């Protein structure tokens, strides 16, 4: 029942802060704003902890001017200013059999990822090949958790950019198409094939000057 409360009454337009009722216009406005917020967010230093709180902070920075629920995961009830409450504990990509994390799996998976990152020292001290493989595993874990109602891709990509930066690697998603990212995501989650994601991260990553100069 509560998932309908993400939309205006009898509409396919997500409730938003921009004053927009046209779903196409909302998409374009949001795309432009999240791109700009990403440019500005890149100026912020990477944190010492790459945790679920940080992921929520990224989503909030990218989306708070668009959605009231920016930074809030979809397992959690969210009450809009209009007094209605929304959430969406279960989500499955269209056309596909394998769903994203359901309900409390979202928190459990983000906790497991946090622990893995801590154990691996945020992927510091790796070879280029190792870093790419490990970054791909982190990304597929994020993909499955899919913690937000919308905006997961933009965030996950920002989380990776900052994780990379703190580990001495530049990860540049602009080097590839959306289609390639989608393909790699589908292969990993729908077809249990982790290779395309590994190749993707190899292709868009290089060690930074400092990591070379050291
Ligand atoms: N069928 C799928 N199975 C698993 N992951 C997918 C699938 N399709 C897309 N993805 C990935 O899910 C993530 C979120 O996609 P995105 O386009 O940001 O949607 P949203 O805005 O709904 O969160 C991206 O990393 C994307 O590549
Ligand atoms: Mg997105």
Author numbering: 1 to 214
What does the paper say about this structure?
Among these, Bartonella effector proteins (Beps) comprise a particularly diverse ensemble of FIC domains that subvert various host cellular functions. The FIC fold comprises eight conserved α-helices and encompasses a characteristic active site loop between helices α4 and α5 that forms most of the catalytic center and the substrate binding pocket.
The structures of Bhe_BepA, Bcl_Bep1, Bqu_BepC, and Btr_BepC exhibit all features defining a FIC AMP transferase as described in the first chapter and elsewhere. Data for Bqu_BepC FIC with ADP, Bcl_Bep1 FIC, and B11C_Bep8 FIC were collected at 100 K on a Rayonix MX-225 detector at a wavelength of 0.9786 Å on beamline 21-ID-F at the Advanced Photon Source (APS, Argonne, IL, USA). For all structures except Bqu_BepC FIC with ADP, the structure was solved by using a molecular replacement with Phaser.
